[PDB]
Design a binder for this molecule. Structure first.
Ligand SMILES: [Mg+2]
Length: 750
RNA sequence: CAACCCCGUAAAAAUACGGGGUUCUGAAACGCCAACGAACAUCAUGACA
RNA sequence: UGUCAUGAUGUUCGUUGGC
C-alpha cells in the first residue's frame, strides 16, 4: 500500500519522521525535501568551479598563528581577478575586509561539503546553533546593504498603481497602504489562502454591473487593471476577518461540487453589491493622461516601513546563505535556483496542510522540526520570494574594466602572448596623449569594445567559465560551428544573413548556404577588422550594424557550447549526488581498492537482494525480465579505473576546461550529448585511464573511437553502470534519444 | 518520448496488441524560446543662458 | 549643463507563436 519501487519508504520515513506509516502522503512530502539539495549542490559545484577557473591556484585569531595558511589567505585574497565577481568582494569601488571574504569563502566551502554527501548532516537545517558569531555579522551586513537597496528601489517602480490605491482609501495611513501592497505582490498574501480569488473575480465578473470594464478600448491596460481588483479583495477580507472565517467554515462543511459553485455564486453577487462602487471608482482612474501624470511625480510619498521588514526583523539565517550564493551568479542561474526553491516550499506547505486536514501525524523529529513546520516554512518562503524580487544591473564596475579590456582583446586574437605585446597594442590602438587624457575625436575602438563585449552577459559567462588564453579553438572546427548554428532557429539566422551579408554573395533563401557562409565568416575573425569603427552617410550605419552583428554571433556561438556542456555535466552531477545519497540509506559502504573507489558496487549488491528482486526496479519474473538481464550483461564490461576517472572528470568539470585540446578532431555532430561523450572519451584515451589486463574489451571501444572519430555507445553504457539501480535514470543517461525531452525520435530498435 | 501498477482477448518468452491511472519513477513544464509590442534605466548624437 | 529630439544596448510585464 503506497510502497515505492526503490524500497526505501521505511528507511526514509524512519530517517525523517522516526517510524513507518501506512499511507502515501509522507513520502510525497519527503521528495521535495530531497529535491532541494539536488539543485543546491548543482549550483554550489558550478560556483566552486568558477572560483577555481578565474583564480588559478578556531576563529580568525588562529589564522594569523598558523603562519602558513595565513600566507595562503594573504595571496589568495589579494589576487586582483576578484574584480570579475561584482559584489562578492567589492563594495562601492572598495575592497571588503579580510574577515568578510574569509567568512564568504568558509561558508561556501561548508555548503559544498554539506551538499556533497567535518560538518554534520543537519548543518543547513540548524544555523541558529551551529554558525559562529563572526559569519553571522557578515551575513547581517550583506542583508543590511540589500535591505536599504530594496527600500530604495521599491517606491520607484510601481508608483502608478500605488497612487490610486492610496487615493481610493481616504481613511487609511500612508504607511499602512504601502504595507499591504508590499504584502500583496512582492511576497504573496494572495497565495496563502483557501480561496481561489482568480476564479472568484471571474465569478464576480459574471455580474452585470461590472461588464462595464470589459470593453475593447480597455485592452491598453490589463495587468495594471487585473491586479487592482485583486488587491482590494485581499484587503476586503482582512478588515472583516469574521466573514473570511465564515466562508472558510462554509466551504469546509460543504457537501458536493454543486454546493461549491453555489457558495461561490452567492458570495460573488454579494461582493459586487457590497463594494462595486469602489471598483467603478478605481477603474475609472486609469488612462494615458493620468498614468503619465502620476509618473511625473515620484517623490510625493515618504514611507520607511522599516520595522516589520525582514531587513530589521529577525530574518532567517537560511535565506542569507541563499543570498550569499546569489551574489556569485548571473540572472539565469539565480532565477532557476529561486524558482525551484519557491516551488518546493509551496509544495511542502500544501502537503503539510493536507496531512493536518486528515488528523494524521505531522510533526518531524526534534532535529528537523525547528525548520520544517508551517510557520518557519511560511517565513522562509516569503524570504525566498523577496530575495528573488531584486532588480540587478550588474554593470562591470569602473575599475575592473582594465582587465576586461585585456581579456576582451585576448579573445579576439592574441592568444597565448606576453602582456607586453598586449599593452603595446593597447597603446597604439587607442592613444592617451598627454597628462593621461583621452584623444577627443579619435577614440572609437574603446566605445565599440566597451558597449559590445565589455557590458555583455555572454562575455562575463565566458570569462567566468572559459580561459581567455585558449578560447579561440572553439570556432576553428567547422562541424561544431555548423551544429551550433543549426541549433539556432530560422528567423534570427535569416536576420544575421541579411545584416552581415557583404557585397560578393547573391541573395539565397536556402538555409544550408546561409549556415555555410556564416560558418565561413565566423571561422576567420580578428581584432584588426574592428580598427575602423566610424567615429561619432548610410555606409557608416550599415558598417556599424554589420560589426555589431559579427561580434554578437561569435560570443553567442561560444556561449551556447559552454552553457550546454555545463548543463550536461550538471545532469551527471545530480546522478552522482543521488547515488552517494542512496548509498547511505541502503547501508552499503563503498570500500577502496588500489587507491580508488568502486562505484559499481551498488548495482552488484542490488542484483542479489530478494526484496529488491521481487518488489523493485530489477525484477526476475516471467514477463518482466529485460533490465535485470541487460544490467547483468553490461556489468561485466566495466573498468574500475575508467569509472573513477569519469567521476573525477564530472566532479572537477574538466569538459569545459580541457575542451581546447580535443575539439579539433571531431567528425560529425548531431547532439550535445555525443559532443560531451566524445570529449570525455578522448580525454580518457589520451590520459591512459584504463586497464586492458582486467577488462580486455576496452581496446575495441578505443579502436572504434579512433577509427570513427565519434563516441561509442557501448563505452557510455559501460562507464555509467553505477546507475543500474534506477532503470529510467540509466535509460535517460545512456540513450541519446531519451536524454533530451525535446527530441521526438523513438528509441532505436535492437 | 520512456518506466510502473490495474481491468480486457491470445500465451509461458527478453510476451505483442487494444482501453484507463501515476507529484507516491526519471527528464529545469509554476520552465526554457523567438518575434511584434508598452514603461524604465543606461551609452553615443543636434537646438540654447 | 541642464533640458527637448534622434537612433542603438539590457532588464522588467503582457499578447501572440513555437517546446
Ligand atoms: Mg519526483
Amino acid at each position: 500500500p503506497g510502497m515505492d519501487l526503490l524500497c526505501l519508504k521505511d528507511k526514509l520515513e524512519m530517517h525523517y519522521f522516526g517510524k513507518t506509516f501506512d499511507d502515501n502522503i509522507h513520502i510525497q512530502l519527503i521528495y521535495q525535501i530531497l529535491d532541494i539539495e539536488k539543485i543546491l549542490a548543482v549550483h554550489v559545484n558550478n560556483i566552486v568551479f568558477t572560483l577555481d577557473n578565474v583564480l588559478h591556484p578556531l576563529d580568525y585569531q588562529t589564522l594569523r598563528g598558523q603562519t602558513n595558511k595565513y600566507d595562503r589567505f594573504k595571496n589568495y585574497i589579494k589576487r586582483k581577478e576578484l574584480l570579475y565577481f561584482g559584489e562578492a568582494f567589492y563594495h562601492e569601488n572598495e575592497r571588503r575586509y579580510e574577515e568578510d571574504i574569509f567568512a564568504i569563502l568558509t561558508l561556501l566551502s561548508a555548503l559544498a561539503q554539506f551538499c556533497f554527501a567535518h560538518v554534520n548532516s543537519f548543518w543547513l537545517y540548524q544555523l541558529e546553533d551551529q554558525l559562529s558569531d563572526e559569519f553571522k555579522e557578515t551575513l547581517s551586513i550583506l542583508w543590511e546593504e540589500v535591505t536599504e537597496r530594496i527600500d530604495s528601489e521599491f517606491l520607484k517602480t510601481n508608483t502608478v498603481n500605488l497612487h490610486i490605491l492610496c487615493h481610493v482609501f481616504p481613511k487609511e495611513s500612508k504607511e499602512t497602504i504601502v504595507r499591504a501592497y508590499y504584502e500583496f505582490l512582492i511576497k504573496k498574501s494572495f497565495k496563502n489562502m483557501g480561496f481561489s480569488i482568480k476564479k472568484l473575480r471571474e465569478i464576480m465578473l459574471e455580474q452585470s454591473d461590472l461588464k462595464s470594464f470589459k470593453e475593447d478600448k480597455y485592452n491598453s491596460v490589463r495587468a495594471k487593471l487585473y491586479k487592482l481588483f485583486d488587491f482590494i479583495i485581499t484587503y476586503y477580507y482582512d478588515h472583516h476577518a469574521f466573514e473570511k472565517e465564515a466562508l472558510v467554515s462554509s466551504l469546509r462543511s460543504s457537501l458536493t461540487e454543486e454546493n461549491k459553485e453555489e457558495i461561490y455564486i452567492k458570495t460573488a453577487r454579494t461582493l459586487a453589491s457590497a463594494l462595486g462602487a469602489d471598483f467603478k471608482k478605481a477603474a475609472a482612474d486609469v488612462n494615458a493622461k493620468n498614468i503619465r501624470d502620476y509618473q511625473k511625480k515620484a517623490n510625493d510619498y515618504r514611507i520607511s516601513f522599516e520595522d516589520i521588514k525582514i531587513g530589521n526583523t529577525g530574518i532567517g539565517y537560511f535565506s542569507e546563505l541563499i543570498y550569499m550564493l546569489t551574489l556569485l551568479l548571473d540572472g539565469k542561474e539565480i532565477n532557476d535556483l529561486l524558482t525551484t526553491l519557491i516551488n518546493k516550499f509551496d509544495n511542502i506547505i500544501s502537503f503539510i496542510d493536507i496531512l493536518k486536514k486528515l488528523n494524521l501525524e505531522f510533526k518531524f523529529k526534534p532535529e528537523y522540526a525547528d525548520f520544517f513546520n508551517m510557520t518557519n516554512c511560511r517565513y522562509t518562503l516569503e524570504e525566498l520570494r523577496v530575495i528573488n524580487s531584486i532588480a540587478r544591473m550588474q554593470k562591470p564596475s569602473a575599475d575592473a574594466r582594465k582587465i576586461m579590456y585585456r581579456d576582451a582583446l585576448r579573445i579576439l586574437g592574441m592568444d597565448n602572448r606576453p602582456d607586453e605585446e598586449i599593452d603595446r597594442e593597447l597603446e597604439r590602438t587607442m592613444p592617451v596623449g598627454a597628462d593621461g587624457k583621452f584623444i577627443k575625436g579619435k577614440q572609437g575602438f574603446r566605445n565599440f569594445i566597451a558597449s559590445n563585449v565589455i557590458e555583455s552577459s555572454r562575455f562575463h559567462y565566458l570569462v567566468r567559465y572559459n580561459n581567455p588564453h585558449k578560447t579561440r579553438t572553439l570556432v576553428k572546427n567547422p562541424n561544431v560551428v555548423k551544429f551550433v548554428l543549426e541549433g539556432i532557429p530560422e528567423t534570427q539566422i535569416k536576420r544575421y544573413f541579411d545584416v552581415c551579408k557583404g557585397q560578393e554573395i547573391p541573395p539565397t533563401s536556402d538555409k544550408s548556404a546561409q549556415i555555410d557562409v556564416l560558418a565561413r565568416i565566423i571561422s576567420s575573425v580578428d581584432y584588426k577588422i574592428f580598427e575602423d569603427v566610424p567615429q561619432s552617410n548610410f555606409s557608416d550605419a550599415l558598417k556599424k550594424q554589420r560589426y555589431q552583428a559579427i561580434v554578437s554571433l561569435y560570443l553567442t556561438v561560444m556561449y551556447l557550447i559552454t552553457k550546454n556542456l555545463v548543463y550536461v555535466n550538471s545532469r551527471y552531477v545530480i546522478a552522482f549526488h543521488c547515488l552517494e545519497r542512496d548509498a547511505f540509506l541502503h547501508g552499503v559502504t563503498l570500500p577502496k581498492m588500489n587507491k580508488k573507489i568502486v562505484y559499481s558496487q551498488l548495482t552488484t549488491h542490488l542484483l542479489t537482494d530478494k526484496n529488491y528482486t521481487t518488489y523493485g526496479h530489477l525484477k526476475n519474473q516471467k514477463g518482466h525480465r529485460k533490465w535485470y538481464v541487460l544490467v547483468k550483461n553490461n556489468l561485466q564490461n566495466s573498468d574500475i579505473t575508467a569509472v573513477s576517472s569519469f567521476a573525477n572528470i564530472v566532479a572537477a568539470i574538466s569538459v569545459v576546461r580541457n575542451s581546447n585540446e580535443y575539439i579539433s578532431g571531431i567528425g560529425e555532430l548531431h547532439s550535445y550529448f555525443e559532443l560531451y561523450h566524445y570529449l570525455v572519451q578522448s580525454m580518457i584515451a589520451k590520459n591512459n585511464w584504463y586497464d586492458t589486463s582486467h577488462q580486455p574489451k576496452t581496446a575495441e571501444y578505443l579502436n572504434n573511437l579512433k577509427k570513427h572519430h565519434t563516441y561509442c555507445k557501448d563505452f557510455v553504457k559501460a562507464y555509467c553502470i553505477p546507475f543500474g539501480y534506477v532503470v529510467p535514470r540509466y535509460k535517460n543517461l545512456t540513450i541519446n534519444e531519451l536524454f533530451d525531452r525535446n527530441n521526438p525520435n523513438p528509441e532505436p530498435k535492437e
